[PDB]
């Protein structure tokens, strides 16, 4: 499996961080293809703990080439920040990173817009991440936006910037009645990093085609969870962009038929940060237990943290949307100690009918009741275990049912944070 | 391939209509996955000539189910017009067409807005086809739009429509200084058809996955040319939609690993409507010859198509973006009677640089001169030939040269309009 795609299969927070780092060991190119500066790859770099949201984690390895495809909305300020920070620790970023000329630019007015659309709602706020991502994609399809390739013609850029800023400033001062954004400041700020940005521009789609013909190992990294997909998720409690492995081709330029293996990161139980359907949410002591054990008090990304059992109906949808090839199971150890474990196998609709596939977004998720398949828990601690024999038969049967209920094999089991605390049953790259 | 994707490989006007129609003889499901009511499929229904812009041509066959994927922006008005006309001619549309709940709605204000923008730039475009498509994509990415799924809950729809119309009218009148669109009208107009629409809604993703594992033949039809793709085409001379096969997974919900064969319609020479880079354009007797022989007259926003030699550098980009399986060659006969034929195999840059891959969009496309390979033309007529024996050796040599320069086989040769004037060297559904 030369071209591998790695993405969370639920609503984010599955634990894609450790796994990504792991595959970086054999991958020669690491490619971001969707979203923006919201990757959330927390890591310990040169002693201290830091977070990379835009630049891939592969920037840390010697002979790995990190790429930001056109699908990513590019914020120069965010890029500049992470660059500086990494250069500080002695990482030669400028020589290990490449950009697509087609990446859309997120500039000051975009953050302003997001921030105004959040506070304009007020009571009925959405819990927008307000990073300017949405407004950048908006200008792109509207075709008044700017991309990295515009920085090659500095005059034209200045002219294009004025027209877009006139339009957005108008909306800002008059409609949202917020502050205006100074054109010259935005112009000077960008013109300052222009040369740096253009120097990392490469024909990414041809590069990836050449890597394909040579059989180079390429990994595509997805930023957010599947069910948060703008088209196919739990609309409207969804995200500002596509999140499924279906965005790989459009977002990178690689042909659709060349995706070899798609790895779904699957957490042993479910969590959702924020509002939205969650048929399997618990409001009792087990919920509390899981929340506590999972040490997910809002540990990385959020204004909420709802716990609940694994939902195979929803995972089955992720399987289908992403044509998953295999799963990597994370956080199994959170279930260590339970007397009885459960997995939702179907939903009972508000009108009495039972379903094995997620209902339409327009259907009544507010009245779905999950049907659970109850099964034996285990007491032996499975944390840090690195062999099958180290997993109590109850846990093995749990793993076994998941594969039977989804039709996708569990090729890797992450039993802890260290690289050595992993069980690779198949390896995406050799498959 | 069980799952086939058919699309134009150049700048449009490649002539896919006849091929799409031929393929629907075998396909069990026909799927639209991108664009809006701009398909321009000219055909002959129940004895009369018609044009279908939104409903797939597959609606004409009893064994076929036509599906309009989420990737398509749907105008309810356009839909109603096409359905009625079809029903009139005796084609029971309502029982053969399905829709996704996630198709964005194009409403009266999207059209007004699209128009306002044209007015604001220049009056010299009889905006009639595809109006509103762009603004609809905008609202969707901004998460403030309406989807078919929203028509289930009437109360909610009304408040949602009220909020977005409030926003757009502010633009219309204050910014564009144009007229506002009436709420009550749109709300009512949209209510008259609401149940007609939601009754055709289905779980498209599940359906396609079911067809996939059952092994039914599914054909996806793309509606524009590859090089006009919003991310990958000749920016800024591109459409607002993605036009490459990578849009299939996202616009229909089919898993990415499930695209089997990608058929690219290739015209034997090139045409381009409007403005933008066209390195192989002709300004001579030959140019006018290809236009007159090819009947390349006005039908694209009031204009004659610009003509030129087949450009294999530009075609190799398409092969790569779409991961093409094979070509369907059209209009070879337009070259009948020329004394020599040329194929462009490389580009000479203004800086004397000679490249065989298309340069970035941010490159000096005006200083590009094409490097041609000339070869003997042929005097024999190749129109309607149905077997390779009826074709002259000089033609077989041209055909052969294209496959050599591109790397992809020419699997179908359409030599005329009748379904019999076709040489199927491979059949996409077997391969």
């Amino acid at each position: 499996g030369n071209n591998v795609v790695v993405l969370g299969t639920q609503w984010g927070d599955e634990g894609k961080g450790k796994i990504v780092d792991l595959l970086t060991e054999r991958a020669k190119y690491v490619v971001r293809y969707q979203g923006g500066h919201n990757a959330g790859h927390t890591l310990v770099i040169n002693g201290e703990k830091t977070v990379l949201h835009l630049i891939p984690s592969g920037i840390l390895r010697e002979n790995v080439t990190s790429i930001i495809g056109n699908g990513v909305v590019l914020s120069p300020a965010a890029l500049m920040k992470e660059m500086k920070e990494l250069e500080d620790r002695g990482i030669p970023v400028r020589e290990r990173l490449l950009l697509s000329e087609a990446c859309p630019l997120i500039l000051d007015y975009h953050v302003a817009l997001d921030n105004a659309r959040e506070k304009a709602r007020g009571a009925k706020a959405i819990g927008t991440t307000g990073r300017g991502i949405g407004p950048a994609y908006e200008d792109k399809v509207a075709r008044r936006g700017l991309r990295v390739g515009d920085l090659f013609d500095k005059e034209t850029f200045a002219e294009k910037l004025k027209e877009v800023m006139e339009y957005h400033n108008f909306q800002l001062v008059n409609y949202y009645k917020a502050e205006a954004v100074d054109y010259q400041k935005v112009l000077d700020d960008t013109m300052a990093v222009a040369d740096i940005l253009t120097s990392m521009v490469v024909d990414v789609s041809d590069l990836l085609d050449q890597a394909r013909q040579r059989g180079d190992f390429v990994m595509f990294e997805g930023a957010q969870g599947t069910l948060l997909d703008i088209d196919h998720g739990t609309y409207p409690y969804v995200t500002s962009s596509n999140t499924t492995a279906g965005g790989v081709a459009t977002g990178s330029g690689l042909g659709p038929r060349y995706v070899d293996y798609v790895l779904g990161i699957l957490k042993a139980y479910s969590t959702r940060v924020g509002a939205g359907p969650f048929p399997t949410e618990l409001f009792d002591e087990t919920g509390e237990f899981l929340c506590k054990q999972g040490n997910e008090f809002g540990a990385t990304t959020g204004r909420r943290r709802r716990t609940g059992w694994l939902d195979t109906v929803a995972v089955r949808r992720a399987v289908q949307l992403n044509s998953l090839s295999g799963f990597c199971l994370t956080k199994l150890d959170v279930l260590d100690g339970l007397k009885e474990v459960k997995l939702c196998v179907a939903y009972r609709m508000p009108d009495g009918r039972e379903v094995t596939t997620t209902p339409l977004a327009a259907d009544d998720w507010k009245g779905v009741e999950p049907i659970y398949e109850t099964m034996p828990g285990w007491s032996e601690s499975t944390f840090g275990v690195k062999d099958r024999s180290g997993l109590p038969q109850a846990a093995l049967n749990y793993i076994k049912r998941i594969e039977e209920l989804t039709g996708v094999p569990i090729d890797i089991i992450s039993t802890g944070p260290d690289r050595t605390e992993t069980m690779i049953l198949r390896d995406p790259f050799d498959a």
Side-chain angles (χ1 to χ4, degrees), chain A residues 171-322:
Chain A
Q171 191 192 171
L172 279 184
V173 194
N174 292 321
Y175 190 83
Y176 292 108
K177 289 177 287 189
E179 41 53 60
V181 174
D182 188 68
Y183 161 80
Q184 191 68 46
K185 196 193 81 296
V186 176
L187 182 61
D188 294 338
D189 284 354
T190 314
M191 228 61 296
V193 301
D195 298 337
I196 291 179
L197 293 188
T198 49
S199 92
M200 300 176 287
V201 159
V202 67
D203 184 345
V204 171
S205 61
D206 177 70
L207 210 198
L208 298 176
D209 190 52
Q210 304 315 301
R212 176 191 56 94
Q213 299 172 58
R214 296 161 43 84
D216 293 324
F217 288 158
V218 177
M219 175 178 77
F220 292 88
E221 195 187 343
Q224 300 139 291
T226 285
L227 303 165
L228 290 165
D229 183 269
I230 198 179
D231 288 288
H232 309 274
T234 48
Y235 188 89
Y237 305 91
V238 95
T239 192
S240 42
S241 59
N242 287 100
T243 57
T244 70
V248 169
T250 281
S252 78
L254 185 70
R257 290 193 300 118
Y258 307 132
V259 172
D260 302 290
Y261 181 103
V262 178
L263 185 63
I265 304 303
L266 181 78
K267 194 197 298 185
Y269 57 101
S270 310
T271 51
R272 205 176 189 319
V273 174
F278 190 177
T280 242
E281 175 165 24
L282 267 4
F283 305 85
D284 61 17
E285 239 58 348
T286 305
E288 284 274 340
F289 173 76
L290 297 178
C291 169
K292 309 306 175 169
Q293 302 300 342
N295 199 54
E296 278 160 332
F297 50 105
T300 62
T301 54
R303 61 282 182 141
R304 198 165 200 192
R305 191 55 57 128
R306 313 202 263 141
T307 328
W309 300 120
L310 188 55
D311 181 347
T312 69
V313 184
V315 163
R316 208 88 55 65
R317 179 67 72 182
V319 167
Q320 163 193 116
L321 289 172
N322 298 301

Side-chain angles (χ1 to χ4, degrees), chain A residues 368-412:
Chain A
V368 309
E369 174 177 272
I371 296 183
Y372 293 108
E373 195 161 272
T374 315
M375 57 180 79
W378 53 87
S379 35
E380 304 89 324
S381 180
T382 63
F383 187 74
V385 177
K386 37 186 74 68
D387 178 56
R388 151 147 304 175
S389 328
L391 283 187
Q393 196 65 22
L396 285 152
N397 290 324
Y398 182 69
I399 287 176
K400 182 54 188 156
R401 265 313 265 184
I402 298 172
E403 295 172 330
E404 298 185 348
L405 291 174
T406 52
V408 171
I410 282 177
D411 298 343
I412 310 180

Side-chain angles (χ1 to χ4, degrees), chain A residues 84-141:
Chain A
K84 263 65 180 292
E85 303 199 289
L86 284 168
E87 313 271 69
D88 264 12
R89 293 60 163 168
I91 304 293
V93 179
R94 307 184 56 162
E95 55 172 64
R96 316 217 284 223
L97 183 73
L98 294 182
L99 306 175
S100 153
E101 68 160 339
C103 292
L105 294 178
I106 295 172
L107 303 175
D108 265 25
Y109 50 92
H110 289 122
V111 183
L113 250 45
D114 248 6
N115 285 347
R117 294 168 177 188
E118 185 196 327
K119 299 171 174 294
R121 298 173 171 121
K124 302 186 183 190
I126 306 186
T128 218
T129 57
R131 302 181 182 226
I133 284 181
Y137 285 125
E138 183 172 351
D139 286 0
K140 184 228 179 170
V141 318

